[PDB]
Subunit: 121 residues, 4 copies
């Protein structure tokens, strides 16, 4: 019963939309971030992911990848959709932001990590 | 320099294998993952993964991310990294991952996420 | 702008409390942490912590890190973050942590590290 | 019997020393990194940490903080000391590098994560 489909916003002011989830748990979406680590102008970017359907849990885990359209980086988020007594949903996620580096010797510094909480609308 | 491509069969440094299919013009790909190690005693099942490669500036060593939707637990893992040509000329994926466990209630969310690394090379 | 200082009693967003003592001229400090939550079935006990604040350029919002040496589990947590003055003028510590569980075999080292955030405010 | 005391090197060519561990599990050390995220010249920097002494485990966990002397950042490492059949030790660790940001709205991008394996030098 906690569904990922909808329009969500996070603590930083970014918004995301997620469409219908198919029977395979696959979904697509859009992400408009309010903040960036680049100096490039932000552009709405696509996202793709899946919800885990094992045991058809009411509060499933999920993951998705945001394919940034204004930088060479990629972010992944994973988390769980929690739904209260009243039907109010929260997604509690963690993410990794992968920057592009030119030299393999600099790989060690390429991955930032953090949390995000999404609520609806 | 060679272009590093994600399509192919890979193995990681713990002996898990994944196969990634063709990457489409939107940077999307599908594959399967067969893990050698596990955080559950349930029998391991090949599981699908889906992700994208970043094609901005058409870099020869692109970043990417994907989600593995495990078929034998309620967890999900995400990986992100970059496809490099290594110093010896081989393709290698340098990745980090978050493994999200399912918790029964929200007050246990703090303990639900593991993190680590993996390096993949082509099989 | 106030200088954000780590000395004091703090509480987090899960009800855990910590107390940090004076910071010496080398940036070192000691404290105690009383966690509201645990991943063990042991009785929680107050545990020591030790860490440092970075004093380079004597920033008024310095970074810092510390290790909590749990006295009721075989695990270790490390925290690192920055002491900020918030938009409302209050001190706030914004931190990230890694909780390292003990495993028995080196093959299981990949599942030993959980990650998360904590924000602390002064009590 | 796996002991943190010694000189170690990691997989990127950084070295560290750790001195005697006291009965409270406390130790001090030094760290000379081979790599940096700053453009400042590298300087050997002190570290302080603890090993967990509960049940006096033969392969203890531990954590420590490196207080960089050439940047405003801090890195913390945590991991476990493993020791094999003939006494060969390896420290398997993960780390968080906290950079300094000027404004609290940029906190989200301040923390990088990675692994490090140390062996005896
Ligand atoms: C709220 C939150 O944590 N995030 C959010 O909504 N936007 C930022 C990042 C934006 C990356 C854009 C591409 C780039 O700068 O390379 S993904 C994690 C973080
Ligand atoms: C090599 C490596 O680090 N990993 C790998 O290849 N398999 C494991 C995890 C498998 C999770 C299976 C689902 C579950 O147990 O819930 S994903 C990160 C780790
Ligand atoms: C609030 C927050 O995120 N944390 C907090 O205040 N307590 C928990 C963990 C406590 C570990 C106790 C020892 C053990 O169970 O192994 S450290 C991160 C987390
Ligand atoms: C091997 C490994 O991963 N690390 C290592 O030995 N040095 C780098 C970083 C050095 C930070 C220096 C201070 C700064 O640049 O601000 S700590 C993690 C990483
Ligand atoms: C989020 O949606 C709200 C209004 O619905 C808008 O005010 C805000 O600018 C959006 N955020 C971004 C980053 O577009
Ligand atoms: C990885 O593929 C190799 C070579 O085919 C195979 O022998 C091995 O069993 C595979 N690993 C897993 C976990 O299936
Ligand atoms: C935090 O300190 C407050 C105020 O003294 C107290 O009510 C609460 O029990 C403490 N939390 C824990 C985990 O001890
Ligand atoms: C590490 O110690 C080795 C052996 O002395 C030395 O070759 C190397 O330069 C040291 N690394 C650094 C970053 O000092």
């Amino acid at each position: 019963k906690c569904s990922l489909t909808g329009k969500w916003t996070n603590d930083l002011g970014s918004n995301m939309t997620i469409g219908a989830v198919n029977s395979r748990g696959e979904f697509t979406g859009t992400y408009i971030t309010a903040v960036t680590a680049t100096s490039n102008e932000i552009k709405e970017s696509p996202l793709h992911g899946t919800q885990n359907t094992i045991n058809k849990r009411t509060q499933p885990t999920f993951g998705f990848t945001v394919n940034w359209k204004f930088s060479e980086s990629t972010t992944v988020f994973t988390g769980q959709c929690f739904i209260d007594r009243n039907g109010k949903e929260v997604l509690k996620t963690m993410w990794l932001l992968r920057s592009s580096v030119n030299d393999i010797g600099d790989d060690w510094k390429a991955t930032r990590v953090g949390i995000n909480i999404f609520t609806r609308l």
